[PDB]
Ligand binder design. Structure first.
Ligand SMILES: Cc1ncc(COP(=O)(O)O)c(CN)c1O
Ligand SMILES: Cc1ncc(COP(=O)(O)O)c(CN)c1O
Ligand SMILES: Nc1cccc(C(=O)O)c1
Lengths: 427, 427
């Protein structure tokens, strides 16, 4: 297994960008060693700069639900770009996408496009405050909602993977309005409310966690959150940037039946291009400029290319059998990966919901971040390298959810299991 | 001059999105309130959803310097999209793009790509505060540095256009670690520093403002700023998101010989695709994850399509007589406008540096925001609507700089001055 090309390129990159990467998660810093420079990606596969081919389970971290380089998405983008990549003015495409999103998502009645998850979460942060007139916010421990200053407290994603403290650069003055708490812990929430009357604007959370491993809400936990926030005139916000259009057409809020007041979207909505969105109840959105006082600008927000990619992407998920297939194939992978773990003598656990899954090297179960932190990070490290040299690409972290697409085949699954068997037999 | 389709389309939009747009300035609120919807852009022109052709001076807010729909930029993108549009792992393109940017801009010894100028603006503040260990930041009235919390106070763009105030979702707890001074007031700055010892991280500003109208730095303004920050061990940061590559290849810092410690880029570097970047001295960039403790990530960061359109744009700008041609046409146009005003009895003033200019309905001269606010916005509103009917497209705000391209011909410059005359002979 040669990685000479990925090696030279990565070495050069370190003298050019901080740690040779455009993002901390692309760093194999915890998973032992150096990364893989990709060359191209198509369907469920990816080819590095040395020729090795892999079956992808990362999918550019989420957008790829239809599979890489999807023919219908890439031709629609071909024709579209003949008209120019950006206007800086309205274009009918915005209406078409805005319309689709309102339909797709239950809570959403009025939308605002933006350029990424980080901008959507940051905008919804502000809006929460402006709308309620309150300063404090309740975010759970291990969750990630971008790197907006106030969210840089007890974050997951790369902060966990890298083992970093909270912040460095965000004033104490602002971090103080961020009240934290263990995921799945309803009692902690209540205690925070009764102890800070008239100050809590809302609760924000990953309806199903993906940045501290994969974690599902406890039975009743979401409903409880709808129930208590209503009682204190507080806002319930679901960061569905990563679960949006993946867990279900309308997301966790549609699947599990609970409707928030504001939701954020990203990833899959771009179709592979930079796109984010935030929206919800009409009366809350009215506070956004140029309709209301809360200002939020964007030179490239709503550009035609991003709009096109997303439109097409959504038209495909809308076809029959979409979410069934995703469930079907991801169940086999999860069950099989667990089946093998037992059969080879290793403590393990995880599960899946539609096209998203997780698998930890511990007995479990995992209900929160602290539980997640008990995984044998040393074992996962040797298991990753193993899965690698066998042609399977996984999130270089024990703290990320794995993804599955409509391009993955029953055969791709089996080939994965087979390699998982081979790898675990040593360890 | 019919705008039927643009009207029904914008009308429908207001039901779907806040204000019916994606960035505030597109609502046309300052110039009558009735926007036109684009269908396509090419070379130096734009086209309505009604069939009208305009000569563009907005150029998508900066990015289209080489002209709309550049043949070489789009063919290049059509070639790269067959290899997928988003990887999630490193790619050779980031290295080549990075290397080019380090070469181009003085201050930059190490860069980090992001998805927007806003993101880069969030980031540089946090980095500057983290590096020094101080929380006070100094900013100027009318300078836009991304719709973020800490900076939504007397900002530019929509703010310095439709009179947007301070805060819009940002508490007194955010906009309190930030100080303010009138752009161009060296004394106020020395004051602020003396008035606040050992607690100012640095100064961030637009080297040339385009967000409060086009405004150039006075005599030894920048030179002064560098010398004072140096003395206090404070950082000098240049938001060159607008100026970079448009004023000069190395932006304003290269043009006026002053070198800041860090700088932010955006717009042009992505060739009309969601992109941004921030870089500066090595020793400081080290603190950025994963190389350092300060967190900042981005899913779509450093993607291939954006890196591809960035490189083709920088290649075209590196050709012979690039910035020469812009200075040449932008002067003929800037002067042409100012001449027609003197001859039609309308007081006005303006100016240009390379392919960027300004034109204010007042005798000026404009040295700051207050100065900018003595403009006759009723005349502008009317003036603007006039030009729109002659087929010339201008920034729908008196506080927004105009832009020129390498596709604008001498003849397009002549015909605008023609409209400029037929129109100014009214009002
Ligand atoms: C739940 C969630 N929200 C937001 C983000 C960050 O948004 P983006 O990277 O699109 O800026 C991520 C990134 N993996 C995420 O998973
Ligand atoms: C100087 C400056 N800084 C930051 C920004 C933010 O730009 P973007 O739309 O890329 O987030 C702008 C946008 N007009 C700008 O003019
Ligand atoms: N999940 C996640 C979070 C942040 C960045 C990335 C990335 O690929 O650059 C992915």
């Amino acid at each position: 297994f040669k990685t000479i090309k990925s090696d030279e390129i990565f070495a050069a990159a370190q003298k050019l960008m901080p740690g040779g990467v455009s993002s901390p998660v692309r760093a194999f810093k915890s998973v032992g060693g150096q990364p893989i420079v990709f060359d191209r990606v198509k369907d469920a596969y990816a080819w590095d700069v040395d020729g090795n081919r892999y079956i992808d389970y990362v999918g550019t971290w989420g957008p790829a639900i239809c599979g890489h380089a999807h023919p219908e998405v890439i031709e629609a983008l071909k024709v579209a770009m003949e008209k120019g990549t950006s206007f800086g003015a309205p274009c009918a495409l915005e209406n078409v996408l805005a319309e689709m999103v309102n339909d797709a998502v239950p809570s959403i009645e009025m939308v605002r496009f933006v350029n990424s998850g980080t901008e959507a979460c940051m905008a919804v942060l502000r809006l929460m405050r402006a709308y309620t007139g309150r300063d404090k916010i309740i975010k759970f421990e291990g969750c990630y909602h971008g790197h907006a200053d106030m969210f840089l407290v007890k974050a997951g994603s790369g902060v966990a993977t890298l083992g970093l403290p909270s912040s460095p650069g965000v004033p104490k003055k602002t971090t103080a309005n961020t009240l934290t708490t263990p995921y799945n812990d309803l009692e902690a929430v209540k205690a925070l409310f009764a102890e800070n009357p008239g100050e809590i604007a809302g609760v924000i959370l990953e309806p199903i966690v993906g940045n501290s491993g994969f974690i599902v809400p406890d039975a009743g936990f979401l409903e409880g959150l709808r129930e208590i926030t209503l009682e204190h005139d507080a806002l319930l916000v679901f960061d569905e940037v990563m679960t949006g259009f993946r867990i279900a057409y309308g997301g966790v809020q549609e699947k599990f039946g609970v409707t928030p007041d504001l939701t954020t979207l990203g990833k899959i909505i771009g179709g592979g291009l930079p796109v984010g969105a935030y929206g919800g109840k009409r009366e809350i959105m009215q506070l956004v400029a140029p309709a209301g006082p809360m200002y939020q600008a964007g030179t490239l927000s709503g550009n035609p290319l991003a709009m096109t990619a997303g439109i097409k992407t959504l038209e495909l998920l809308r076809q029959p059998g979409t979410y069934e297939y995703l469930d079907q194939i991801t169940k086999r992978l999860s069950d099989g990966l667990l089946a093998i773990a037992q059969e080879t003598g290793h403590a393990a656990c995880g599960g899946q919901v539609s096209g998203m899954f997780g698998f930890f090297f511990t007995e479990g179960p995992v209900h929160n971040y602290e539980d997640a932190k008990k995984s044998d990070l040393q074992k996962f490290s040797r298991f990753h390298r193993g899965m690698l040299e066998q042609g399977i690409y996984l999130a270089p972290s024990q703290f990320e959810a794995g993804f599955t697409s409509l391009a993955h085949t029953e055969e791709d699954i089996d080939a994965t299991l087979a390699a998982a068997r081979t790898v675990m037999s040593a360890l």
